[PDB]
Point group: C3
Chain length 332, copies 3
């Protein structure tokens, strides 16, 4: 009986950070309680000041990373305040039945609902909104995130030995389709309903106008760059709810990668770049060996450096000249 | 001597259904005889009534799924009736030599040919027409299908234990490139030769106008939805002869997936979404655990819900509230 | 101490050929010395005579394949002659630290530099230029290649048994984005700086105008077709520094494939087609079983046959009628 299980309430954090958890499960199965509040809000997504009407779980793009263990029950209270204008729901790729929960969680503004599902498969998974007839519009307005379902005994390598991360980050990658006029400037809209047909037209080009990490060009740089130390083991969970991506750590690797994110499989070793299919979350484990700045990108470099899909690590520690050195510095 | 082998004649069925076969081979190697008749025909591919000139094997898009076992010989009689206007051939990705059979099977209208090849590698494979100089036009006009070459002892999981499907479906996914004018309406053509340069121009955009399962928007819905029962093990073979796709069962998973379709490899477990590369067939095995409607989609959701790449399962049986339940139904 | 190690100097060859090497390492770790000279040069990339300003390592697109063994040190002298006009550098996906070497190798025209890095991970890897702010422009101007880091005991199959290739080829696949006017003709430019904004605009379409192997439409055909004999084991290393591809040997297979190119993983068997993500090198091993012409393509067949991503093998030897035969040749 589920009512006999411990309940634990989790307060979610903003990406790229992840709420506190234990890799190896320190209790038996639990009901893990999450609350998310849907927020429709204006967001500036690039340096030019382009502004879209984002559709968010808990105020951010992507929505926050939820973390549980296999055979836990996820119980989500989803709140759609009357300050929103649209109906929303949620579909968990981690769940089984009713369109991942979508058919059960349809909330008009001013409504709320509570869904519970059993996390029967270990892995990182996409979650996203999916209202009948308007699915890609909501997903491509930012209304998606991920959930990680850890094996009860934590992560394992291809030989079945433990892998333990010191830090974990969640990189949500978002394709936006800002409608353009004939001349190619971004078009502006007065209401959701007035925006919709132009939103559909832009999407159908299959050409994103922007592709960003954590909701905006440059969001994971500067003061908000990811950080680590030489010697630290870092897990980067990466999701793309609608379109393929190919993550790459410039100057590093994916030492162990579950490119399609499912932990009952052995990881792929020593990856330079890996393909995360649209509608998927993946995870990469890396131990840093050199200090300095790294870029973490979608390695369609146009998508990276022109459309926005690039962030940075700043890594502290000792430089290893055995691993790499400049023998003769650039000179004439 | 091949003439010493049993011969078995197979009458093919229309996708998404698959001709009768046994997973575990009940005989020694055989010559398996298939006949396909090429049909050029008009097809309505969307709700708006858009009509293209489809190029088909046996009257359908995709062509039918052929099923044999490893080390069987496939003997195909390919008929090009004089009511067609184009030369066609066939290339089997399952075969070895002469461009998969293409160099040997070139048939003008009013001709026929018989090809035999040995199915030396187990897996699902694309077949498609490929006439020199006009390959993508034929393939993207619908002239492709798949063949499944089963291991003689049937399918196995990642541990080498048997996997046995109760039902099997074949989902052919087709990218069409309907030429558009300046204003963006579909352009109309009086003959194949008159259509060709505009067909090439549309293809070169690399942007499909339609992406459909079983030949049309909505073809696998309603009375033609796929079906199953809770507890049933279902194999979905999925092919894309020209362009990448990322299949996903909404509300389910791929319990065991050969994303690139080759059965000597262990399957990937517990997949939410998987990448089938253009020019490939893949296969996913799932045991249904919940009743109700599922959508089965390409999880580029724009390709799914705007361009046509979505079908449904209707699944009967008992709802499992342990697996998923609405704790509090949507309310204000 | 690295100064105690043998030094070996390698003179690189032009793709698709590969400098001489041993699969099983015949010495202990070495410092392997390579020199590459950057050349900006005009290149004709199609049959129509379209001419771009290519940015090359050592005069070719792709740059040459470098070959070393795991735990060797790669020491590259990179020369940027004063006859070039741009600043360039190099990033090795095989290397660890300073953006793969990019942050250390920035050379203005008339400068040179020497980088050394330890090849700690076995596999095929992309290398490419990546100057801050101009990365995709350089990469999509042809300024990329690959490096193969062989396991010290050579290649292994999925069971840990030796795989030994008789021949090896390197296929570099290049996406170009030639800017077009309103009417769709290729636009012409007087200097790099004058070309740049239009180069960016074209790239942002995410639609290549050309996709070629070894630098031009038809480069691996005719007198320059790849060759082999029935019975020969051939390794095809394939790279795509910026955009996904899905290689396929028409009439053959990838008997053993490392689609994302990293040799500590078991290969995928019997592949028809495989996905190499942008920013990745992959490798396929095939034993030819039939003579004749094969095409080797990106199996988005529009990208292959319209945009340029197709080459040929010409294979000599004995035809095997057991494997494939025409039972009845095409006739009315
Ligand atoms: Cu929504
Ligand atoms: Cu989904
Ligand atoms: Cu045809
Ligand atoms: Cu093919
Ligand atoms: Cu450069
Ligand atoms: Cu790179």
């Amino acid at each position: 009986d589920i009512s006999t299980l411990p309940r634990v309430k989790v307060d979610l954090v903003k990406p790229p950070f992840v709420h506190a958890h234990d890799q190896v499960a320190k209790t038996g199965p639990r009901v893990v309680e999450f609350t998310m509040t849907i927020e429709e809000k204006k967001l500036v997504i690039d340096r030019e000041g382009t502004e879209i009407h984002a559709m968010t779980f808990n105020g951010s793009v992507p929505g926050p990373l939820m973390v549980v263990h296999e055979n836990d029950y996820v119980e989500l209270r989803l709140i759609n305040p009357d300050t929103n204008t649209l109906l929303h729901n949620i579909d968990f790729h981690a769940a089984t039945g009713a369109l991942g929960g979508g058919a059960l969680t349809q909330v008009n503004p001013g409504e709320e609902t509570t869904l519970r599902f059993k996390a029967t498969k270990p892995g990182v998974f996409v979650y996203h909104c999916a209202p009948e007839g308007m699915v890609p519009w909501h997903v491509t307005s930012g209304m998606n995130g991920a959930i990680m379902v850890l094996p009860r005994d934590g992560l394992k390598d291809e030989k079945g030995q433990p892998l333990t991360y010191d830090k974990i980050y969640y990189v949500g990658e978002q394709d936006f389709y800002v409608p353009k006029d004939e001349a190619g400037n971004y078009k502006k809209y007065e209401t959701p309903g007035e925006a919709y047909e132009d939103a559909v037209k832009a999407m159908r080009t299959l050409t994103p106008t922007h592709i960003v990490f954590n909701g905006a060009v440059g969001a994971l740089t500067g003061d908000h760059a990811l950080t680590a130390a030489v010697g630290e083991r870092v897990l980067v969970v990466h999701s793309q709810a609608n379109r393929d991506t190919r993550p790459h750590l410039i100057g590093g690797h994916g030492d162990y990668v579950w490119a399609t994110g499912k932990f009952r499989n052995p990881p792929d070793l020593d990856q330079e770049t890996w393909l995360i299919p649209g509608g998927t979350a993946g995870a990469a484990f890396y131990t840093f060996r050199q200090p300095g700045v790294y870029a973490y990108v979608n390695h369609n470099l146009i998508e990276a450096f022109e459309l926005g899909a690039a962030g940075h690590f700043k890594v502290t520690g000792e430089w290893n000249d055995d691993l790499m050195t400049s023998v003769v510095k650039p000179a004439s």
